[PDB]
Point group: D3
Chain length 263, copies 6
């Protein structure tokens, strides 16, 4: 209902510990209209290299919004209104495998949705769409993220299955044994779904750069929120280097089409 | 979330007894995406004179949707997606005054909102808008409707205050005495608000052509739904003539000030 | 979805201070299925004279449910499932006129609805109904209540307009001046609407026996909930006498029809 | 709240590609009252052989309603109001196993519910019911469908586990590996639950005739909505023959044990 | 569920144009737990004179929240958790009378609630409370605000009836004529209710200092949001002097009694 | 919003068949305020040994509330307002293994959450909390329950994984094979989650004493509600002895701290 005059081709959704992306030189905060209400915070917009970039911290100012209350539809709609084509999510995840260590990055290629109470789509009728998500993340952006990590010599696992749980509580030992031994998941978090599905419906090329912040229930002391924030803080510098490099590497234009998903 | 390639500059919203406007030569029914879900029915789009017109029966097929359940936001959003600039509403109303006659048309110029359970705006945050509605209807469209009625010699009152109630029940005698003797309203219905509000927020030029179908509680036998449908049916031919003539009379382009409404 | 085996032709809905109607000899409490969930409490069913009567306290056990949270649709649906034809509501009201004194009964004949956001109907589509409520209460039951009061020599005003407010707060002085000097209301409460409209939609013959429990904002000391309960308690005996007598006076069968209200 | 005069003993719920069942000789469309609002479309009622049959397309006209927004409670309630005893569901499913072929029918005998956002029951209190669903489908109807397929020589698998997902997106590869390799499910869809749950609560004898329309993520090119519609269309003729024959084969009367399910 | 260690005895709720109260010398922003979710923004807490004061802008950062979406329950709950006893609201209002001029302050003593879509109470059951609000504002705080304005020689009307409308649209001319001539209202706004209700239920002593920012529909050019912000900006300095002086004038302790409101 | 004068250090939440705990010598029923509305019933408070104990039947009077509609947040909030530190849940569960026999008690040590439609937390923002629940039950309370069962020679399994399903329907055979063979669950119920979550967020020490009432789908006749009630009734006396003994064995004070869970 409002003409959006600001434009950005790349959107960055920051997770825990990344309220300030540390990637902008000059920027401003803007309010973006959505028919779903409030995005998590105002959108920070500014130029990086030759790119206009939009940033939104999914938990908002002061990490005031828990995963189950994030307005995922408003956040993705706001980025679409700005003309965003590429969406880079940076998240904190727990590792379900001894091989994915604290501070390691992971560029997942699959996910399993264990969420419960969310709004999963922009298409509630009369235009019905069933998007394919066999390979849920954008391959070209995943490949560019992997190349950037290799170029910067930042330790990064090139694949992984992300299991998304509802939260806000962390998993019981029985649940985590199920996630690992059975669902064959590698990392765990609470925010990927429905963000990734909505981005696909919005015809964006979305990928996640996850950083392992804890070993879930598997280390001598199980995961606590304090641990997650502390570990993410120790690794913000590397995350910002990776992001800054990846953003300049992206080509102009890259789920690209809804035609075969529309009934 | 999907590109709407169908286009219409004029939108007609049909009320009771007007499921088929009888104004189209060639037409088709389309599904229009909205972030609010389902409009009342598929929209009928077709050309009249040199105008592309979109028609929507607000109660849907078979008059299946009561006033309090109409998805007013989806209906106005759908028309906006089609590029509609002029919205003509045709409605059935009760007369609260005895000098009017059944079958007379009224082009109201004011309203009093007594609704209770509705969603009144497209602006829920973060972009706050407070539209001015001191003169709630579009003056240019009201004037063209009045000129059309004069040209066709169709008895029409050129002003009036519409009191919109919640429904679905009709008013008690005590409420109607208040509406007429204290508020000084002229006509009464259940569907004007929030339709008019939303059209204004969408920067459309909206006007209502109301048809007196009953005398509310004031005749020997009080209003019933059966009476409303019966009287509306006796006057549909005149309504269709008025509607057909008005549509061709409209200029290409005409609440066009969201700028001063935005905080 | 449940076959309701128990039957009652008369339903009593008790308001403030009437958890125990004091009218049954033998009775039992039953759970009644409704598609709207929970009625205010289990329904007490038993015989009085030659009639099967069902009783339900609208605020539930311990007056645990405030007016704005009462499940009016479940309460009326439960009585319909039992075969109830006559519904007698007993309520506590404030007086807006010096002539309607504490302890006086009032059999209202009109109402004005000032409630906000309650659920007003059983007809949300696809079967649309617009019931006529010009004379909102059942005339035959009002007349029998008046005759019973006259026979018992219980002081009772034979007409009156009930203004129903949302609550739970009581009115400001400016609001009460408006209800009286303007809307011409006589008594005030918080529970009549939507109970009366739902009963009409369910084709029952509904009437209210109201008892004045306070003078709203007009006495030197404005109304408090403590006053309402105290005054109601001082007049329970008279209320029970009136109820017991009216119940036996009712003929077998008496809004009687929905035909002309169905679009 | 209104008397339903129309009656049918058999109800058909059509899925994707089955808006027109092609089984009626003479029929009409009716609006059926429900306390849950709108069924997916007006019901089509007509006689076939010696029986009255009711048909409802679960996605509505133009496939306007996605799985997660279908009013399952209104659809089943409407069929119950009509007196339906047998409910035959025709649905499109993906095969999770490669030994099945596109176009094969499957008469499942079990399901696994992975839905997330739905209303699962008609019993929300005060009448609590916990239906048994160990064998979720009606055995007598499944057996009659299997006999019909054998008599018509239509290739049909006589058992199978249906995993019902939330949608509207299709599954990721990691999710589908879990559904097949771990859960051992055979077919997958989005509409079975809570339709089957509700039909059991309504004491109906429900069974699904599923049509394999894709191989989910397992063929060279993963499932798309376009493929589902295309394959369904190629096999509608056979589905109509099976339906027509089954309907005439059913006895007058056959989950009719609500007694032991009521706490 | 959280122990709140921060404390303030005075709370200031700032309205339009008052995001920065300009009264703190040293302060910090805190997050306050509420069972209703998010207050409008973090609460600014700091010392002024010998008082600890808490400030909350009701529209949030960047005036991102419209009146109909403000979480009034969370805002008042947060102030109660901090130990607030006095609540001073500063608001922008339209004048319905030509002698209450632009920039004049008004200390209303009554209100009329015309809101429609809000949550009005903290008491939804099982503890039922009906607060008595005949004189809705705290007399002692009103009297101190009036004394302060007199001492500073700031033009202020010492009484007035505030009519609260739902918004976000402004009133039609017919509604405004009704508010003035019929309801006898003096000023109009959108945010007083339920804020005042809830403060009374929380046993706080609440008063409003209103600033006339427009003449509603009565000047040659009707009210616009642009005008409201402009006039408010022209008078912020005076509002800050009034506020600063009143805050220091308040006694340590003063609706301070729910006992008689409890059923 | 009101001061709770009543105090209890131990809370007992009773499940199916335990409306009357048979543990009190003298007690009374009280209404406890919560910002979430209605707890399942009035809270029974009384003395046992040297302790004040609060009891709440989670299904309410007459087992009127099914698992999916229980107001878990109001029940745990009410116990917190009373000062409860220890919470003992007594529940009915199905056994997924043939060596956990009818009437055997189980003190689970883990759970798997398969619920779908519930409110899982007290922390919806702005104070975000992610409680750790690797070992979801209070170890000290579990150990005391186990010691009590040993002292009374009541057959009890000292560990076990509880899988919580949504209900109200019972599981299909395919789902149950999955819970056992795939998730490695031992017992199954519908009420543990979110009760346990919320108790941990409220910093209470919570444990479940489960009673095997059926073999789910694994016996010759699958579980029915009638069986669950019958088996629970056959073992009520034993459950009451365990409960009475455990209550007196508890020390004054024991999820102890939220500090590390707060972001
Ligand atoms: C700041 S602590 C909470 C955040 O941690 C992320 N997270 C990190 N480790 C885990 C884990 N082991 N399980 C689930 N979410 C996790 C979640 O997405 C949530 O937003
Ligand atoms: C078909 S009967 C119901 C319709 O009648 C219109 N209507 C006609 N007369 C009246 C009246 N007297 N009061 C309220 N609505 C009326 C309403 O807008 C509603 O959609
Ligand atoms: C027990 S105190 C609250 C009850 O008092 C009734 N009531 C009595 N007097 C008044 C009054 N003056 N205004 C509104 N409701 C009133 C209302 O319907 C409410 O259920
Ligand atoms: C018309 S495409 C969408 C429909 O496909 C059905 N469907 C077909 N194949 C699959 C599949 N592989 N996974 C999930 N649903 C499927 C679903 O029930 C949905 O209503
Ligand atoms: C900033 S423009 C919107 C604000 O103006 C206040 N307001 C000012 N003048 C008026 C008026 N004439 N009618 C209603 N609200 C008004 C309202 O409370 C709303 O938050
Ligand atoms: C009185 S029958 C319903 C209750 O049975 C408990 N229950 C007992 N056995 C089972 C089972 N096999 N599966 C699920 N819930 C069960 C549930 O928690 C529900 O509240």
């Amino acid at each position: 209902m409002i003409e959006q005059n600001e434009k950005a081709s790349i959107g960055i959704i920051g997770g825990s510990g990344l309220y300030d992306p540390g990637i902008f030189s000059e920027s401003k905060e803007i309010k973006v209209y959505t028919p779903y209400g409030q995005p998590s915070d105002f959108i920070t917009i500014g130029k990086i290299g030759n790119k206009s970039v939009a940033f939104l911290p999914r938990h908002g100012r002061g990490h005031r919004i828990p995963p189950h209350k994030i307005n995922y539809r408003a956040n993705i709609w706001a980025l679409k209104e700005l003309g965003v084509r590429w969406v880079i999510s940076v998240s904190a995840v727990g590792s379900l495998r001894m091989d994915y260590k604290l501070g390691d990055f992971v560029i997942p290629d699959q996910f399993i949705d264990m969420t419960k109470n969310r709004e999963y789509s922009f298409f509630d009728g009369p235009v019905v769409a069933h998007v394919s998500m066999a390979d849920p993340f954008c391959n070209s952006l995943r490949k560019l993220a992997i190349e950037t990590a290799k170029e910067l010599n930042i330790k990064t696992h090139e694949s992984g299955t992300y299991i998304c749980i509802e939260g806000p509580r962390f998993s019981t030992r029985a649940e985590s044994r199920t996630w690992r031994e059975v669902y064959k998941a590698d990392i765990i978090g609470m925010t990927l779904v429905p963000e990734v599905n909505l981005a696909c419906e919005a015809q964006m090329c979305y990928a996640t750069i996850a950083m392992v912040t804890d070993y879930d229930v598997f280390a001598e002391i199980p995961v606590t929120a304090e641990e997650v924030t502390r570990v993410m803080a120790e690794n913000t510098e590397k995350a910002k280097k990776l992001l800054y490099a990846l953003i300049q590497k992206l080509p102009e234009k890259p789920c690209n089409s809804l035609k075969t998903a529309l009934v």
